[PDB]
Design a protein around this ligand. Structure first.
Ligand SMILES: OC[C@H]1O[C@@H](O[C@H]2[C@H](O)[C@@H](O)[C@H](O)O[C@@H]2CO)[C@H](O)[C@@H](O)[C@H]1O
Ligand SMILES: OC[C@H]1O[C@@H](O[C@H]2[C@H](O)[C@@H](O)[C@H](O)O[C@@H]2CO)[C@H](O)[C@@H](O)[C@H]1O
Lengths: 141, 141
């Protein structure tokens, strides 16, 4: 739709930051579209990933980190609040101990910090979605 | 780039048809982009898939068919002629007994017919690529 995908925005994160994403899958769930949100340590796409969030719509969610080029311990979830054929609202909050992912207002995943959020310099949103809104909040000290 | 992705074209296939696709992955191989080519029995995306061709760039290729709504026997290949960061040329030939997939001029995969190619009514090309060329040939009787 309106925002380019893959979507890249230079970003900084700290405790209390919220990343808000509104979008829609590009295919019915039967065809297994993906969504991926990566919090990167540099603007280069090859850079480390502090928080990797990958939705296989209708099937599972995978979370991990890529640290000095290597993927670490995968977290796999079958929780699937996303609805077939529907627009979704995604909110990722930077809490002191973890990321908290809200989906359409509902707490849906959390992921403990493995690298401090201050290491983030870029956010990329990509795979089989269109996007109409992306925001990183910058209200807190 | 130039062609919309997901890309959909109404299509007919028979022995001797060639589907030609030129495109580029939207991410470096380290970030595991996908490419998917589906030969559908109807224009609806939910319709059966006579030939499903799914590249996880740098890792593997999966082929299958979706018949009366159900995925059948997966074929998994580690053959990976696609090159990191490069444009690719993909040619899918409809031979009497199988599809033959050429990648950059090189025979790279084949998949025996499970449903007659005459059942195809649509081709979709999607996931993490841009496309500059798509053609279905219509030269043969
Ligand atoms: O875990 C998320 C991450 O997986 C990558 O693949 C990892 C995989 O997680 C792990 O189980 C294996 O031992 O190593 C793989 C590669 O280092 C994928 O590249 C990726 O897209 C992510 O989803
Ligand atoms: O095989 C290609 C096809 O897999 C689908 O998932 C299948 C899977 O192949 C099979 O091993 C399992 O037993 O059933 C699954 C669902 O019916 C995926 O949906 C897909 O994207 C394809 O890659």
């Amino acid at each position: 739709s309106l925002l380019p995908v893959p979507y890249t925005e230079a970003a900084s994160l700290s405790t209390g930051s919220t990343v808000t994403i509104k979008g829609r899958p590009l295919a019915c769930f039967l065809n297994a579209p993906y969504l991926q949100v990566d919090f990167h340590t540099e603007m280069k796409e090859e850079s480390d990933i502090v928080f990797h969030f990958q939705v296989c719509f209708g099937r599972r969610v995978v979370m991990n980190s890529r640290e000095y080029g290597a993927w670490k311990q995968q977290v796999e979830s079958k929780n699937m609040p996303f609805q077939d054929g529907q627009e979704f609202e995604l909110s990722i909050s930077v809490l002191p101990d973890k990321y908290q992912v809200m989906v359409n207002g509902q707490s849906s995943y959390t992921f403990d910090h493995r690298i401090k959020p201050e290491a983030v310099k870029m956010v990329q949103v990509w795979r089989d979605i269109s996007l109409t809104k992306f925001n990183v909040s910058y209200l807190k000290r």
